[PDB]
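for ur thesis appendix - S2-3, Lurch crystal form 1. copy paste whatever u need, i formatted it the way the template wanted (i think)
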Amino acid sequence: XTRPD
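the 3d part is after this line
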C-alpha cells in the first residue's frame, strides 16, 4: 500500500 508505482 506504500508504493503503487
